[PDB]
């Protein structure tokens, strides 16, 4: 039922959470943010990183 990411699709595969506690979206599919493996350290989504 719930949707996430910038694509507004249901959760699938590995999801990564924006480290900005105020991020409106928070969770993104690895694929939608160009990831294939969990990155070390803090991670911020494109919008929060200023894309």
């Amino acid at each position: 039922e719930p949707t996430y990411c910038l694509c507004n699709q249901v959760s699938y595969g590995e999801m990564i959470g924006c480290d900005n506690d105020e991020c409106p979206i928070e969770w993104f599919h690895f694929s939608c943010v160009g990831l294939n493996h969990k990155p070390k350290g803090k991670w911020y989504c494109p919008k929060c990183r200023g894309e």
């Binding site: 959760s11 699938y12 590995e14 999801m15 990564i16 959470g17 480290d19 690895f30 969990k38 991670w43």
Partner: peptide, 8 residues
Amino acid sequence: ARTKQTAR
């Protein structure tokens, strides 16, 4: 980073 696997 914080990540989680989709679960049914």
